[PDB]
Amino acid sequence: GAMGSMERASLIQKAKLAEQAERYEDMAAFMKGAVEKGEELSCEERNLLSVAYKNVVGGQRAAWRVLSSIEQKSNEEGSEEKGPEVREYREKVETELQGVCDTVLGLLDSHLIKEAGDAESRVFYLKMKGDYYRYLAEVATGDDKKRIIDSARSAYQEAMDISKKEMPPTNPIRLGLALNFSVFHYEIANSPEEAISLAKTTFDEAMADLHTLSEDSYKDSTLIMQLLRDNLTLWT
Amino acid sequence: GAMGSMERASLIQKAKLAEQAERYEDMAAFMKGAVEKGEELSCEERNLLSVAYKNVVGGQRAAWRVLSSIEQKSNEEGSEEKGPEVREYREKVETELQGVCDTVLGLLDSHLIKEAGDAESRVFYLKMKGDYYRYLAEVATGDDKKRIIDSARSAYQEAMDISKKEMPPTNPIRLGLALNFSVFHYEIANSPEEAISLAKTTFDEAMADLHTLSEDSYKDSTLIMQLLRDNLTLWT
Amino acid sequence: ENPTSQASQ
Amino acid sequence: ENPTSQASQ
Ligand SMILES: [Ca+2]
Ligand SMILES: [Ca+2]
Ligand SMILES: [Ca+2]
Ligand SMILES: [Ca+2]
Ligand SMILES: [Cl-]
Ligand SMILES: [Cl-]
Ligand SMILES: [Mg+2]
Ligand SMILES: [Mg+2]
């Protein structure tokens, strides 16, 4: 890999610089290089990895949605034929997006998840696995769409099971996992009742645990609780 | 080139899609492919070319400024030594930026400028040449910095000479040229008095010509006049 | 590049 | 990607 000659610490330092410069593709390549050094990642390093790829794939997904909407309009009644270009360019973006998702899932499988023994790391990585299968599911249309959905579901479910046994209800990783699994139910699995029930129960259990927290931890947890509330307000 | 197999019209269509998707690197590659077909560009096509590369290089310049500022802080009295990484990554971004500028200048030299005979196209392309030499000048520090500055100046000057002979004072291309040449004087050539004088004279001559315009042309011209005014307010 | 529009985190 | 901060057009 092109980062094989760079020190692990230098890769982490440059990932942080790339974040400050809003150069998220560089940031992701630096963190990919750091992961490929073969050592486990610290809490801060896991978050750098997540931030980098979230921004890269987030932009690809936003572009894909723009192009898919144009493509759908072109297929309505009365739309003038414009040739293959819209489909071609949506496919190009889609393929690039799938490639990034495959890269992230490859890092998780070789070998981040299998070495991750603490709840905070294992849940973090399993949530990522669910997220990137969910992004694949958003664009899937063929023989494997159901298997892609079930891969997302399975990763989220394992993360939920660990997080409920090993973390308090206000833990930000647990909360962000529940938020995204609830979005999976609503947006991917055609299960809006499950999405609402999960978001509400997660919110209420966290509310009841806030009294145990410092001011800084309270701020961290309530921020994500507000995201659960925003979704419930949108969905109900 | 990787776009050699795609129809010119398809490249233009996909450039417009990439703009809607905010995929400016794709947009630039599509327009580069269109230019390399060897036909002259229409007014709309010239603007697509400019928009694409302005966004690509604009983001690189913003990143370079972030990194250069961090690098400068690291060289102050009392800053802890952190190794070569900041310099290395600033150099990486700088090199990528210079490569994009060289690509644009190459398109202008092979062969957009030499075929451009109408004032609107010739001034447009010469302004671009000035702009991309100005971006090179912003990061230049060696034996050729003066020659890079003079290349920017020379391109702007030829564009100004044509625009004053061949275009009305409210022409948006003429106005945007004068705006950017005034910024060249202020930011690159250490000539703030020249920058202010050019901006003021450009503004005043355009003001006196507004009465000749339709409502839509008036809107186009006053928008750029406001940018001249904003700079004068900042500079005086 | 991540938008702010999505329901996820 | 072009910022809005610069004095140029
Ligand atoms: Ca080492
Ligand atoms: Ca371990
Ligand atoms: Ca052809
Ligand atoms: Ca010609
Ligand atoms: Cl394409
Ligand atoms: Cl580097
Ligand atoms: Mg029709
Ligand atoms: Mg010290």
d(Cα B16, Cα A85) in Å, to the nearest integer? Answer: 11
B23 CB neighbours in chain A (<8 A) are 63, 93
Burial letters B24-61, b for 16+ CB under 10 A, else e: bbbbbbbbbbbbeeeeebeeebbebbbbbbbbbbbbbb
Whether A14 maps to a domain, the answer reads yes
DSSP 8-state symbol, B118:
S
Which CATH number belongs to the domain containing residue A160 in this structure?
A: 1.20.190.20
Dist. CA A181–CA A159, nearest whole Å: 10
- Residue A193 burial (CB count, 10 A): 10
Distance separating alpha carbons of residues A59 and A65, to the nearest angstrom: 10
Rounded to whole angstroms, the Cα distance separating B101 from A53 reads 28
> Is A1 within the bounds of a domain?
no
Residues from chain B that touch A17, judged by Cβ atoms under 8 A, are 67, 70, 85-86, 89
How much distance in Å is there from the Cα of A80 to the middle of ligand 6?
A: 48
Q: Is residue A193 situated within a structural domain?
A: yes
User: What's the reported resolution, in angstroms, to a tenth?
Assistant: 1.8
The residue type of A30 is F
* CA nearest to B16, candidates B49, B39, B43, B40: B49
Nearest by CB to B176, from D3, D7, D9: name it. D9
For an interface test with B, the pick among A24, A72, A89, A97 (most B C-beta atoms closer than 10 Å) comes out as: A89
| Partner-chain contact B176 D7, CB within 8 Å | no
Pairwise CA distance, residues B91 & B161, whole Å: 36
**Chain C residues close to A224, C-beta within 8 Å:** 9
In angstroms, what CA-CA distances link A10 with A15, B55, B85, B120, B194?
8, 29, 6, 49, 45
How many C-beta atoms lie closer than 10 Å to residue A228's C-beta? 24
Residue A37 covered by a domain:
yes
What are the tokens at B21? 């998707």
A192 in a domain, yes or no?
yes
B2 inside domain: no
The experimental method behind these coordinates is X-ray
**Which of B85, B84, B180, B69 is closest to B124 using CA atoms?**
B180
- Selection from B25, C7, D3, B190 nearest residue A195 by Cα: C7
Q: Per the CB < 8 Å rule, is A179 touching C3?
A: no
Side chain identity at residue B202, one-letter code: T
Distances A29 to A7, A35, A103, B1, D4 between C-alpha atoms, Å = 14, 10, 10, 25, 27
Tokens of B232: 């004068």
Q: How many CB atoms lie within 10 A of CB A141?
A: 7
Q: Does A191 touch chain C (CB under 8 A)?
A: no
- CB A116, CB A40: distance < 8 Å: yes
* Contact (CB<8Å) C8/A179: yes
**Distance from B36 to chain A by nearest Cα, in Å?**
19
Q: How far is the CA of A6 from the centre of ligand 1 (A)?
A: 8
* Both tokens assigned to B75: 């060289």
In a domain, B171, yes or no: yes
The domain in which residue B61 lies consists of 8-236
Q: Chains with 3 or more CB pairs closer than 8 angstroms to B?
A: A, D
Tell me how many domains chain B contains: 1
Q: H helices of chain A, where?
A: 8-20, 24-35, 43-74, 85-107, 113-115, 119-139, 145-166, 172-187, 192-209, 215-235
Q: Is residue B12 part of a domain?
A: yes
